[PDB]
């Protein structure tokens, strides 16, 4: 019922996927007791900046004490989870950018915390603050009182002034990997009692592109389409991507100058009902992958295991120069595709151009 | 607990200040000879010691013994100034108080004599954030100041100040704090803190500081936490790698050396960071263009890129001019075709591949 | 109270839309199961019906009977939404409210409970050009909106949106409607309005619509207004300049043989008669594509174009495939640069003159 991203959040340091280096530093600091007064989190979207920062606030103000493993059951822990903790002040810098708001904030730091050990200020999207706002925080951030901590999260830290950066410890998160995303999806779906297939999850993880919020958003969409099931057929239709076998087969026909087979594949593709831009993109993608493999054997990834041997033989046979000619020819065709009378006409003419200028077997030229 | 390295290890004497000889020497001579101005301006890079020197100068003037270049550091005045609860010393954060309404109240009480000090010193931090009216009010009171008050100004943007105020004060421009000087201070702090360290770890941190000593302390504190109470070369090297942003220069070096594995590794880590691939090509083009001009004239490279001057110089000497032209031309073609590539990541990889091997065949 | 077809025939139920079956199926399943999301994003080409689907979705959420995928259309909430004066349904024209201060005022409004309906839908249209500050303001509230607020977004160019905002909403990409779907819809609308029409006339209008149903209705009104209240093949052909029998074929034959006098005379005669220059290039491109197909396989040519079958086959046997590509490329450039030429006729003459130089 509830959104997966909102329902499933890390309530403990053990529930976060990846970002081990950041967690190790935080755990060591709390255990040793060398606690700073200004933390800056950076990274791409959906990496867990807010989730990590919220967890850190729980540890500092936990009833048991300053620990790297919050209990999650005391009054302070549960209130922070609900987002209604008095000593946890969260500021939306995007909606509070004027210096007047910033000066109001600085007039409250002096007062002691109500019940918590520390008064933690969590500023989200801090890169939106005005130039005058940064300088207002500049002096107090260097020497805060003993009972205040500042947590900052920003997607683009390059916008912040150089002076602000030097006053805080900066942790840069990294984009999650395909395997990490896949494992998390398996755990979530299994806990949700929803069927799934191995291939469907791989496609969702690949489409996430280094983010976990994206994967969860796609998963919610996929569940609705499949009526409570996540099948490979449903996901493939949703992403609007044809299986690599069809695309690879078309490329194999093109290189061998088998025009009749190429026309047959196009007719089948037309019956399938897939955008003609997708076909060119996939054909370009495979040709690029062949070039990368030809550069180094390790270029090929684990995802394309089903057609590993088919691409390897193509790289061995086709010279590097021929790959360049085919790759560039499709790029020019993609540029001129919008101006063609019809999408089928544009794509078909592009392929005929490649066959006409085939390096070894051109079309027969009449006298 | 354990405080912070920056806050804990504040300089407390002219001897503790690292470098800045051309500033401390002038101040010591002035105080000893009695030739003291009314307005002092401090300018320099961030975290270079502008505020620290200002407080030391204020403490020396107001010390019980007299106007001495070396404050005793033990009398009541010295300790109160260090603790920041001294009545005759007024510290103002100009950044948080920009409107002229607050400035007038501050400047009203300049006529009154100091309560317990020889001089009443006003310390203004980030003075470059004062409105137009505030500068006028400050200029009015600064034109004819009483003999029993002094004004100390600290800022990193002297350009924003009006020319009128600049002409009525002596300005000291603090210099970048070298490289070895930062290393020596870190070694002194660590052993005094009973923390293990290695020569390699300190050198890496010193270079990463880039002339700012506050940055070195912040990195040093982070390294200690990562190393679990120790500063090892392994832990420090891993931490710096996570914060590297010099991918573009690394790509050019790998591109010239023709190392396919090195180029792909750089791309993979760059993707993990989340860099914009369009930006990456633009900055690489700038580096290639800059290197070409350096070959034409040795003076084409300015001080704006002193951090990587040595690496840039080496490329110019070794790479023949023709190779630079070919690489620059190939990247121009790649940028034009990037929008129509199957993906931005793939577009950069393909263009780099054409840079390593293959060359275009021009007409005729 | 006369209103044009594009405004009169807006869908009022899911069953009344054309195509977009995958989008409707996904939405219907979600409402039935109960997996209701916070933010929805609809993207696609112009005239596909992003606003129509979004408005229908709002009706189902706030319907009196319940959260269903088949709005009744008779209850008080349904009718008011159709009229466009429903208190809870707040519609924002992002094209005219780019100012950040407008967005900030909106955020402060969401804290209040809905007046009558059980949801407070914020339908934002043309959201692809808000100021950067406006987008960043929505991030915090859009991530975790209150229980009783929903966000519906519509855009034509989602590339301009920041990556952060996209990650927080479900994306539904709509495809351009097929020619057959457009033709069927036009025939249904005209039949309901009791307006005479012909088979070929609908085909020409659907073909020129280029997958946009909004454009198809606009052309239909233009034809009706100038067609004396009826749609006829001669009226539509006169509306958009269409070559009759062999106007394009004769021109390309002269171009291939590189005969300057014939090409200029044909252009001059065509200009005097008066035709659409863009249409001339499109037909010339079509013939070249057909000739290329014939070279690949003699059976590619269709039986419908049997009037000029002999002439086209002769060209295929005489011209190498490579030269056909050059002519095809040149005409595409001419169409690309035609709007930017000093005169439409002048641009065409430049295009033909360039092609005449290819022949040895």
């Amino acid at each position: 019922y509830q959104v997966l991203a909102r329902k499933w959040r890390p309530q403990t340091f053990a529930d976060v996927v990846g970002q081990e280096h950041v967690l190790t530093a935080l755990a060591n600091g709390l255990s040793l007791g060398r606690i700073h007064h200004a933390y800056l989190f950076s990274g791409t979207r959906g990496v867990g900046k807010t989730s990590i920062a919220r967890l850190l606030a729980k540890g500092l103000n936990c009833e048991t004490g300053i620990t790297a493993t919050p209990c999650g059951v005391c009054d302070n822990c549960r209130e922070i989870e609900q987002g209604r903790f008095v000593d946890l002040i969260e500021i939306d810098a995007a909606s509070r950018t004027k210096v007047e708001d910033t000066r109001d904030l600085l007039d409250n730091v002096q007062y002691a915390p109500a019940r918590g050990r520390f008064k933690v200020y969590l500023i989200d999207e801090v890169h939106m603050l005005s130039r005058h706002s940064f300088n207002a925080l500049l002096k107090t951030l260097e020497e805060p009182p003993e009972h205040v901590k500042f947590l900052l999260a920003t997607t683009d830290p390059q916008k912040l002034p150089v002076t602000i950066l030097s006053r805080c410890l900066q942790f840069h998160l990294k984009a999650l990997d395909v395997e990490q995303i896949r494992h998390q999806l398996e755990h979530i779906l299994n806990e949700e009692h929803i069927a799934h297939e191995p291939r469907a999850l791989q496609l969702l993880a690949r489409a996430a592109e280094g983010s976990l919020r994206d994967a969860l958003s796609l998963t919610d969409q996929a569940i609705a389409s499949g009526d409570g099931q996540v099948s490979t057929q449903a996901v493939s239709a949703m992403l609007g991507t044809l299986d690599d076998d069809q695309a690879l087969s078309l490329v194999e026909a093109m290189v061998e100058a088998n025009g009749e087979r190429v026309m047959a594949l196009i007719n089948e593709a037309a019956a399938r009902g897939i955008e003609w831009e997708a076909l060119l993109v996939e054909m370009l993608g495979l040709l690029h992958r062949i070039a990368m493999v030809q550069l180094s054997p390790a270029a090929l990834g684990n995802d394309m295991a089903a057609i590993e041997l088919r691409m390897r033989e193509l790289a061995r046979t086709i010279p590097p120069t021929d790959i360049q000619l085919y790759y560039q020819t499709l790029l020019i065709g993609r540029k001129e595709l919008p101006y063609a009378p019809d999408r089928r006409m544009g794509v078909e003419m592009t392929l005929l151009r490649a066959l006409a200028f085939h390096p070894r077997m051109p079309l027969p030229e009449p006298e | 607990s354990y405080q912070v390295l920056a806050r804990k290890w504040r300089p407390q004497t002219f001897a503790d200040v690292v470098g800045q000889e051309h500033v401390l020497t002038a101040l010591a001579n002035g105080l000893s000879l009695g030739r003291i101005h009314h307005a002092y301006l401090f300018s320099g890079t961030r975290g270079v010691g502008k505020t620290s020197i200002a407080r030391l100068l204020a403490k020396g003037l107001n010390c019980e013994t007299g106007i001495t270049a070396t404050p005793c550091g033990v009398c009541d005045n010295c300790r109160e100034i260090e603790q920041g609860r001294f009545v005759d010393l007024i510290e103002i954060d100009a950044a948080s108080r920009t409107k002229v309404e607050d400035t007038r109240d501050l400047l009203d009480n300049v006529q009154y004599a100091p309560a317990r000090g020889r001089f009443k010193v006003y310390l203004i931090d980030e003075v470059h954030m004062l409105s137009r009216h505030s500068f006028n009010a400050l200029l009015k009171t600064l034109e004819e100041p009483p003999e029993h008050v002094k004004f100390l100004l600290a800022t990193t943007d002297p350009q924003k100040l009006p020319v009128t105020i600049l002409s009525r004060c002596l300005q000291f421009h603090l210099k970048a704090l070298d490289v070895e000087q930062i290393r020596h201070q870190l070694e002194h702090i660590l052993n005094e803190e009973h923390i293990a360290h290695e020569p390699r770890a300190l050198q890496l941190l010193a270079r990463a500081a880039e002339g700012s000593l506050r940055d070195a302390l912040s990195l040093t504190d982070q390294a200690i936490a990562s190393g679990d109470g120790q500063v090892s070369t392994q832990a420090v090297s891993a931490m710096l790698g996570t914060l590297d942003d010099d991918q573009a220069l690394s790509l050019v070096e790998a591109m010239v050396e023709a190392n396919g594995e090195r180029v792909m590794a750089l791309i993979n880590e760059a993707a993990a960071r989340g860099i914009e691939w369009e930006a990456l090509l633009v900055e690489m083009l700038g580096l290639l263009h800059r290197i070409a001009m350096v070959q034409l004239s040795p003076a084409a490279l300015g001080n704006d890129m002193a951090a990587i001057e040595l690496r840039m110089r080496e490329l110019a000497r070794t790479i023949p001019p023709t190779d630079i032209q070919l690489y620059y031309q190939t990247l121009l073609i790649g940028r034009k075709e990037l929008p129509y590539a199957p993906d931005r990541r793939m577009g950069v990889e393909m263009t780099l591949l054409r840079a390593l091997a293959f060359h275009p065949r021009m007409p005729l | 109270s006369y209103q044009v077809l594009a405004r009169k025939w807006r869908p009022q139920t899911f069953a009344d839309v054309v195509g977009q079956e995958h989008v409707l199926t996904a939405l219907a399943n979600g409402l039935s199961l109960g997996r209701i999301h916070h933010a929805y994003l609809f993207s696609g080409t112009r005239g596909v019906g992003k606003t129509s689907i979004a408005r229908l979705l709002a009706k189902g959420l706030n319907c009196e009977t319940g959260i269903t995928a088949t709005p009744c259309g008779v209850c008080d909430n349904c009718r008011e939404i159709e009229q466009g004066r429903f208190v809870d349904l707040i519609e924002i024209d992002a094209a005219s409210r780019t100012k950040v201060e407008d967005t900030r005022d909106l955020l402060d409004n969401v804290q209040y409970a809905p007046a009558r309906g059980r949801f407070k839908v914020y339908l934002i249209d043309e959201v692809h050009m808000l100021s950067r500050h406006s987008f960043n303001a929505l991030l915090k509230t859009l991530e975790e909106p209150p229980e009783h607020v929903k966000f519906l977004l519509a855009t034509t160019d989602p590339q301009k949106l920041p990556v952060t905002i996209l990650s927080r909403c479900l994306q539904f990409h709509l495809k351009a409607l097929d020619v057959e779907q457009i033709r069927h819809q036009l025939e249904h609308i005209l039949n309901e309005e009791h307006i005479a029409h012909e088979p070929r006339a609908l085909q020409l209008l659907a073909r020129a619509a280029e997958g946009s149903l909004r454009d198809a209705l606009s052309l239909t009104d233009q034809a009706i207004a100038s067609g004396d209240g009826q749609v006829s093949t001669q009226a539509v052909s006169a509306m958009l300049g269409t070559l009759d029998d062999d106007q394009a074929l004769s021109l390309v034959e002269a171009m291939v043989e590189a005969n300057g006098e014939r090409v200029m005379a044909l252009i001059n005669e065509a200009a005097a008669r008066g035709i659409e220059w863009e249409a001339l290039l499109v037909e010339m491109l079509g013939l070249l594509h057909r000739i290329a197909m014939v070279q690949l396989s003699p059976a590619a040519l269709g039986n419908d174009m049997a009037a000029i079958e002999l002439r086209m086959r002769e060209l295929a046997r005489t011209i190498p495939p490579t030269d056909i590509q050059l002519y095809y490329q040149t005409l595409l450039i001419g169409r690309k640069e035609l709007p930017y030429a000093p005169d439409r006729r002048m641009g065409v003459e430049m295009t033909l003159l360039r092609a005449l130089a290819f022949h040895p």
Binding site: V293, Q294, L295, S296, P297, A315, R316, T317, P319, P320, T321, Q324, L325, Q328, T329, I332, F357 | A258, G260, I333, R354, L356, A357, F358, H359, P360, R361, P363, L364 | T322, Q325, L326, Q329, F358
Partner: peptide
């Protein structure tokens, strides 16, 4: 020059000729 490359030049497609075969690590053939 030849007609093939001239037509490709007019068609807007560039030809890439291998320069450092040692860079490629594989059975390029």
């Amino acid at each position: 020059t030849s007609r093939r490359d001239w037509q490709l030049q007019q068609l807007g497609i560039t030809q890439w000729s291998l320069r450092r075969p040692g860079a490629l690590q594989g059975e390029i053939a």
